[PDB]
Amino acid sequence: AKLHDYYKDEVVKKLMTEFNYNSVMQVPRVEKITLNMGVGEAIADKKLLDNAAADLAAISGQKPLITKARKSVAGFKIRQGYPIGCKVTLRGERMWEFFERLITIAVPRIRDFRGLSAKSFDGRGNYSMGVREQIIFPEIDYDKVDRVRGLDITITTTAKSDEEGRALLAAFDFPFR
């Protein structure tokens, strides 16, 4: 919420100053943050998958959508319609909160952290990262975890260009490299 508030008054203004946009609608805005834990190895056991889902939920206060396999592949020994991942599409106040947590609290907790990768923006403005150890979110209790698990965070935004997206991210602190 705080982050959102900051954005409306400050970040947007900064963007306007720097890029010289015509409208206030033209400024990039983050549309959704899409968390994903593609557990995969849950083909052996669904309990693991469940655990992963729980962890995800803890991290970001929604409850994940257990994404199944779209097409079958024998390289990983999966069928189509196998629970083979879990996602959390975040939007709005909750999403903002999550973002804040990531940037202000959780990214600082990353092990051996010397900033993010700036060269990781998909072309069309949207950012993605992935946490190696999911303990970095303080929502997880270290005594309870059984698996060295992780997820990928994915900041979707209205930015047309990658550069714009990057700028937006910067305006929301974001260390990069």
Binding site: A57, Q62, K63, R94, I105, P138, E139
Partner: protein, 66 residues
């Protein structure tokens, strides 16, 4: 959001070591005691320090001094 079957989402009080009292909505439940935040964690000084290391000639000079 669909009621009941989400986890609880209370506005807890995160409090790190360096005086940054931080109120956020999370699903920990209890109040959080952090190490590091954006207003302390080295992504400004650390970077600087890491970079400033490499050198052989200087070392040699130090060892010898003429």
């Amino acid at each position: 959001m669909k009621k009941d079957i989400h986890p609880k989402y209370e506005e807890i009080t995160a409090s790190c070591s360096c005086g940054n009292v931080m109120k956020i909505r999370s699903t920990v439940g209890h109040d959080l005691n952090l190490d590091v935040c954006s207003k302390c964690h080295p992504f400004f000084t650390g970077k600087q320090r890491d970079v400033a290391t490499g050198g052989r000639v200087d070392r040699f000079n130090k060892r010898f001094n003429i």
